[PDB]
Amino acid sequence: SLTLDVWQHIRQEAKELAENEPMLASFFHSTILKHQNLGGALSYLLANKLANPIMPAISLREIIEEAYQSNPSIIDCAACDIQAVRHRDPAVELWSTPLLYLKGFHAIQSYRITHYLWNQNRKSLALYLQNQISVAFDVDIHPAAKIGHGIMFDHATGIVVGETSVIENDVSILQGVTLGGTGKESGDRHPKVREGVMIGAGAKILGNIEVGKYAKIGANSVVLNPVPEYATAAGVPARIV
Amino acid sequence: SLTLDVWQHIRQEAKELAENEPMLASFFHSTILKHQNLGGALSYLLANKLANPIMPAISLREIIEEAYQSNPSIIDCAACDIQAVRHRDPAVELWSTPLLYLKGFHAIQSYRITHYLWNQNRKSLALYLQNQISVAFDVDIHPAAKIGHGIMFDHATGIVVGETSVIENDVSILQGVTLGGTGKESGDRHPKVREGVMIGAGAKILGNIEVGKYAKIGANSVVLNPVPEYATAAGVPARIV
Amino acid sequence: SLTLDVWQHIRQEAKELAENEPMLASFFHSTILKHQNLGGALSYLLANKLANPIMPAISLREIIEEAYQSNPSIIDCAACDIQAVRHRDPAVELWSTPLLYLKGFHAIQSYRITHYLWNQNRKSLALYLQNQISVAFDVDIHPAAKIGHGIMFDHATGIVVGETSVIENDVSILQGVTLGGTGKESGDRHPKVREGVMIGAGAKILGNIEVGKYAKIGANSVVLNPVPEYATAAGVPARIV
Amino acid sequence: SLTLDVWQHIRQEAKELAENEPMLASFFHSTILKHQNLGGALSYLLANKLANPIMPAISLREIIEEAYQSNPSIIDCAACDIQAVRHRDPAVELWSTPLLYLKGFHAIQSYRITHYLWNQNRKSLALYLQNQISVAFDVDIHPAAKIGHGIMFDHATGIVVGETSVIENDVSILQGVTLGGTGKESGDRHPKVREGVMIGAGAKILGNIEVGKYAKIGANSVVLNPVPEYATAAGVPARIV
Amino acid sequence: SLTLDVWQHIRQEAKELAENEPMLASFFHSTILKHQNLGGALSYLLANKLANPIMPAISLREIIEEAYQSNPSIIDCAACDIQAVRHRDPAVELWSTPLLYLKGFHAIQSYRITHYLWNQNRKSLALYLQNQISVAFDVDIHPAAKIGHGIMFDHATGIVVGETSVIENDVSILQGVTLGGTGKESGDRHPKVREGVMIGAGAKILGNIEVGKYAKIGANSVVLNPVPEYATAAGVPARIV
Amino acid sequence: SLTLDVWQHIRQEAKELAENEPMLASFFHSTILKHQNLGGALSYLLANKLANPIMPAISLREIIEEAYQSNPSIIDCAACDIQAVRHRDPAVELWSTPLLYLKGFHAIQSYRITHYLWNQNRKSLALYLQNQISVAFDVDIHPAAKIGHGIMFDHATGIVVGETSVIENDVSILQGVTLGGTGKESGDRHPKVREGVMIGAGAKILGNIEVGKYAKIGANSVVLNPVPEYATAAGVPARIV
């Protein structure tokens, strides 16, 4: 219902947009209209955006499709993610825009493929794609990280998320945000960003520490200690305001 | 004209570079020497760097040239921006380096096309190109933003300029800088950066606030409050100094 | 010999990895298994990654090899860098991983080619490649910067290293880090980062200043003053801790 | 099914071939081994070889696969055609070989798509692909031609088959063969080649004439008159021998 | 103007074709509808079809367009060439078809560019393009040949025209036809095909000899002797009938 | 060495031609002038002309060079072949022209690689390339055919050499020529064409037959019987003359 609604909004938009812009009309038909569900479209776009002669789009599309088949909820996150960005970003009005044009959104959804592959012990492929993702969209997310749905990577450029990190539902992350890693450890070194959290541009959250639900982290904050539920944190190093 | 003065410096440099670097001689000839004016070299270059099978270089060129044909001051800005970069960056000695090699310069000039397109109601196309610029140059500038001339985007990775921003003439912006947006609004949300301002690397300027003419923002500052003319602001959050 | 050791380690892993991932098997063979030494594999990958019609991989590879043949220590640095990454980054377990997949490692080894061309007064070429590195890896390093070996550029996106900079051996630099630049100085404006230094994410180090051996710079710090050996700097601006 | 026997044979060769040639191992896996039937492999290959930026492989595959869903005996024909080539060409040993490497086989199978499109009244797409087929394979078949199964287009270079041609089952056609077009007439202008005919290299067969079942046409022969069942025609112009 | 009427017919078809086929709609708009005249459309296509990284579409277009500038009769020939193919080929109905899809037409128009280039003493570039034409369309026409207009190369595969050939207006040539060259001469070795001639598939016209106006050459014919006006020639070697 | 003489000539032509055509300057430098011997230039050229994502030019180049290194006579044949074409084609005047622009020349040299691959039991790779040659150059020659040196494939469209053929030294072959195969039989089916033979355009020679030294086959001839030394054969079927 969420997934079908979003898909139908996107199709409805794609018809209007193709009428208005004949330079992109075939793009709208081949990327959205001639497909039958969101997963058909997402796999097409991601495959194109991540293609390389080592593994071209046509062949990569099949890996993505097998992932969607064997874990259908990956596509459902994408639908939440589309709605989340549209809602929270005043610049985004169309349902189709995140799907078509936002590289943070593409990064997130592409990470869901590497996470799947990592859990099937196709680690070498996950790593190959981690890099593609990083090069295509400027976003470095380790395949082993655990990310919920309703996530917004707003202007994703510069985001880094480490192997042990956890991002729960409804979290929002701006450009230049780093999650995790103190100069020290191994075996569980990265933040746990609980649900509803807002993280401002440039913010560095480092270490196995909790950022509690509905916390705001200030722009360019360096967060080294746990942040309580509903708190605001700001400064370098960060203080609870 | 500055355009014609920069153009003639660029041609004179190309001839000598072509002689000294035969690997790149055809590049200098097809990019610069066989074009009558700056517009031709700029339309050729941007079209190449922003090309995609959805809209190849040869086709994009025609859009860029239609923009130059109907708003020629767009090219006059490019020349201002070239001079700005060469003048303000000690590492850039040649007039041609910005045109050929500086991705920050390239993003700005590409934004100018998207701005044009946005004002012609070709908004799908403008969004499509916004994404391309973000992928090609690591710079996110919304087409509706208002940017003047003589602007330098130096090593421009991670720069973000929001829908509602204003950047006046002779402004300098380094890597990691974002303009705008408290998570507080729709309608006019982003900064107005006035003439001659220098914004240091990694600074975040958030809100519908004034950064007054000739101010200096220190590196990694978070500017949440209006900065008076000629002031230096610094720290997270920023204080006057 | 570290070079030979690392290379044997990487060939060992490649045969095993080819066995597990048939989708990637030929990639491991043409990249690693059918080359006699590290420099054959390196020149292959970097050429592919920096390829452009202006200078396709097949040409570029020759240039990289001329540099390797006439300056073998470039390759020995690569092996140090590989070991540096593996040992220092917890997420990195295989010796092949840095070689194949990490854009930070690729950008450093690429800079070494641009440094060589700069020193042979082939500066057009060095500048053309600087821009390609910046596009492919989102790492901006001036060809004239002097960088040692045992270097890690961990998740390298947004790293900017200035023309005058020096980075001594065994330095670690994370995403978002800038080296150097203030105002109208020329001729030696950029930091000297000394052996063993560790620069946290988002740090901006500005000016012709010293960062003393084995110092730690905290994340998002702005370093305007020289940093003592074995010291920790944090804050905006940075204070000794 | 001939189709399933042929497919089994192709899968069985592909495993052997992948072990023998690690330069090509990934190619055998992405082309054959990771697909579930002959249609998957055929649509993948054809899409790749007819790809253009106007219609990339990944889109083209969708269109080809739709044809296969609507008319599965298009695949059964390919299987028949593979068997034909392997059997009649002594140089062809492997079942995989026609599927992978024979531009005549590819031309025919591609024609089957355009024929389908032509009857679905998508004549623009059909003409577009007729050109792409002509350029990729050097075979010019009009989409309206009627071609049965068991067909071999051996070496196929300069084969031309007119709009009104009929080629029945089990016909063999060598390089440089032209079907049809006398003088000027309109409406039904091209040969009807009957079951089991062998047409030698260079033969030109003009006008709405019957070439009867099991006839042989000699090399470089011009056939202007009907050829009776089991007859051998030869010379310019052709006489029964 | 024939040229103007042809162009207007083409646009008119493009409008209706784009409405019928969404997959090709953008192609129609960017190839035809968004261009002012036949010359702009033709330069777009040829550039694209002969593109190579040595000279990309975008660069080559400027050269094609320079030729069109300093000798606009080249574009008029193209317009007759289009009318000829449509009028003489029963299979070709639309004015747009030859422009978009017929490689015989594309080869002819492409040779006109090389002819221009040859006569401007740009012989190295004319030669480069002669090879590109031959690779792209399988038609080998030497730059120094003299071809008039109203020419139809129907299904052009295998056509070979030598350095001294002369083809006058309204000539028709099918697949596999060769013009000229015998037992070693130099200086004027090649046929002079006068106007209104029709040359059947596979015919080979060797030596410096007149093929008289309005003659018909038979398929697979070898014409070693001069052919009188209005005459039919057939056989190998050829004889008047 | 013939090799060296040819090489010096070519190098000197490229210097002049580079100076005279700046659009191609870097092409002359990257293809010819920066390589030390003919092998270097050849492997570069052929790698580019046979490249494909399945095996890109950079990897193809290594295979080609391995062959040249382990069997240096292959390069010597190339030089003979350059000389043969230059001498025998009156249109071909420069020594660089064959190396750079003639598909017949390229097909022959590409065949030498497949033949080498075949004789190293790399049957799959040789077959992969057979097809690439056939697509790149419109020439089908089987890797197991035995071809000598001083060969000319003059305008090569449509040439077909069977698996069992033998072409001894100094044979010339025009467009549309076919060697061999009659019908049922295996093991030694194709013609043995001896030293010096000239085969005219369109000639089909079929069966395990001797074409004796310095024979002349006429255009469009079908040769079913043996041809005596110095004899001339012409017609369909061919009679000695």
UniProtKB/Swiss-Prot annotation, chains A, B, C, D, E, F:
Root EC class: transferase
- Which BP terms does GO give this entry? cysteine biosynthetic process from serine
User: Where is this protein found?
Assistant: Cytoplasm
Listed GO CC annotations: cytosol
Q: In which pathway does it act?
A: Amino-acid biosynthesis; L-cysteine biosynthesis; L-cysteine from L-serine: step 1/2
Q: Which UniProt keywords apply?
A: Acyltransferase, Amino-acid biosynthesis, Cysteine biosynthesis, Cytoplasm, Repeat, Transferase
Q: What is its main location?
A: cytoplasm
Q: Say yes or no: keyword Zinc-finger present.
A: no
Instruction: Enumerate the GO terms in the molecular function aspect.
Output: serine O-acetyltransferase activity
Q: Report the EC number(s), separated by commas if there are several.
A: 2.3.1.30
Query: What PROSITE patterns has UniProt attached to this entry?
Result: HEXAPEP_TRANSFERASES (PS00101)
Q: Which reaction does it catalyse?
A: L-serine + acetyl-CoA = O-acetyl-L-serine + CoA
Entry superkingdom: Bacteria
Give the family from UniProt: Belongs to the transferase hexapeptide repeat family.
PANTHER family (UniProt xref): SERINE ACETYLTRANSFERASE
NCBIfam families recorded: cysE, EPS_EpsC, PRK11132.1
> What is this protein's name?
Serine acetyltransferase
Its source organism is: Haemophilus influenzae (strain ATCC 51907 / DSM 11121 / KW20 / Rd)
